[PDB]
Amino acid sequence: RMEIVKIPVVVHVVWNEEEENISDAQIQSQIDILNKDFRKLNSDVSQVPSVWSNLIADLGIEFFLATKDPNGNQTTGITRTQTSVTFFTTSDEVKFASSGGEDAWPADRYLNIWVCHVLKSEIGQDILGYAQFPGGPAETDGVVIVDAAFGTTGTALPPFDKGRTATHEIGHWLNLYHIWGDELRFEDPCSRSDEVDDTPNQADPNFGAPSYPHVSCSNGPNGDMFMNYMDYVDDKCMVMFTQGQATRVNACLDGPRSSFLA
Ligand SMILES: NCCc1ccc(S(=O)(=O)F)cc1
Ligand SMILES: [Ca+2]
Numbered sequence: 001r002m003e004i005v006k007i008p009v010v011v012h013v014v015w016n017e018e019e020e021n022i023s024d025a026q027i028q029s030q031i032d033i034l035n036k037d038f039r040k041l042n043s044d045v046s047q048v049p050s051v052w053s054n055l056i057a058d059l060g061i062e063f064f065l066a067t068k069d070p071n072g073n074q075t076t077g078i079t080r081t082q083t084s085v086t087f088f089t090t091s092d093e094v095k096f097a098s099s100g101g102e103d104a105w106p107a108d109r110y111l112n113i114w115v116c117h118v119l120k121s122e123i124g125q126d127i128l129g130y131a132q133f134p135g136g137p138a139e140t141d142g143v144v145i146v147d148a149a150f151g152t153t154g155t156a157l158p159p160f161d162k163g164r165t166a167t168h169e170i171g172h173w174l175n176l177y178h179i180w181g182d183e184l185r186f187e188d189p190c191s192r193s194d195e196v197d198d199t200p201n202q203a204d205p206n207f208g209a210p211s212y213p214h215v216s217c218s219n220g221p222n223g224d225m226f227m228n229y230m231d232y233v234d235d236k237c238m239v240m241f242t243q244g245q246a247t248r249v250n251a252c253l254d255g256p257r258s259s260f261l262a
């Protein structure tokens, strides 16, 4: 029997123009996706190649917008903060009210999700989201997602309109690594590991909508598990976690995030 871990979520919408102040329905549509993907209840799990069917995991995690704020008072679980900032970066400006964002709620009790309109890497590349792995500091724990990649209605735009950027980032929040191993440009692309045996060794990230099989690093004939949530493919193409990843998620829930256990 699976112990279902029920994670209270607070969504911090940080908005400059009015359209960035995304609707309650768009926020709720994202929570709905999380409660499918993290329970193996997404119908598009049928797209997994049959050779890997016995690897698809139910992570046993569910999510809900918080009903009590950190001091025990009634809440919608959504904060809405106007800002003059036009873009945020991986340096975590969105996570402090003093830098034009919104403070985190206590990370031992809530999953903080920040939503903003423009998000860039430190060297200026537009990105869809970023996570903080377990291990503190609490002040910046959580995930950040751009609004055009958040939810399945409202401002969400194809090909990132099925809610999977948040599934992916929450994968990181639960201590999952990119399936391809995050080699640096000068390293052998087959050399690093995501520390999961049942994810095939893989050269690089996959983007877009790859054709099965996509072989790399001598992993033929089945190829890359590019439909894993921890690849970089379009939302409609990533549909599964593996049991090997669930092992790491369970270790995270049992250790550094044990405060979320009942
Ligand atoms: N389903 C979305 C997966 C995903 C997540 C993040 C990115 S990127 O912004 O880092 F380039 C790309 C694709
Ligand atoms: Ca692996």
Ligand SMILES: [Ca+2]
Binding pocket: 180, 181, 182, 183, 189, 190, 191, 192, 202, 203, 204
């Ligand atoms: Ca690799």
Ligand SMILES: [Zn+2]
Binding pocket: 168, 169, 172, 178
């Ligand atoms: Zn990632």
